[PDB]
Amino acid sequence: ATYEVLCEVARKLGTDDREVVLFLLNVFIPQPTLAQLIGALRALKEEGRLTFPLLAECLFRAGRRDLLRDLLHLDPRFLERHLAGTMSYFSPYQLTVLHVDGELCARDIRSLIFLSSTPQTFLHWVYCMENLDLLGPTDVDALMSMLRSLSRVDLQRQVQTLMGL
């Protein structure tokens, strides 16, 4: 029934978007496929962890303001002001990670995949480092260094602002 809405979202969610989304919901899956993606979402719904207002910001942060407006029926301009007055279901860690991921350019990413048994996208990296207990909301020194290996001081300083001092 309403499960079809969640599909149409996945079905229109961009390639890199699937990783951004799944990352935000803590059900990360490297370069997922539709079946895998919708599968994951569907699971978060049947459990009750994926709520409309969550999927809403989730998509807002992801940048798919168009999906928000045409599929969920919310005015992104509205939601922006709303979100700018609440707590955000996402941690300042994730928001920083998502910030970086978005600011990294071809060179950087292409280089990151190189400088690194596998990753192929920045969110894939952060994912592993997270399992290897190297990166986490507790300490982002690793992510802080990763940006030093790529000449992104402007970035490392940004991550530094969004967390410690």
Binding site: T51, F52, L54, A56, H73, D75, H82, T86
Partner: protein, 58 residues
Amino acid sequence: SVQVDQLRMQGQSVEAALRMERQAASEEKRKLAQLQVAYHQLFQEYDNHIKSSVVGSE
């Protein structure tokens, strides 16, 4: 002059329905407009509800 009257009378029936039609369109929009505001309202309520139902004690 009668075939014309048969027209002026017919064409007028059109412009009439076209006026009634334009009128309804204005009301319906008013209707849609409310539902949009309704939707957002529900949203805002539902949202704040969740964020408020998060608190532990002793």
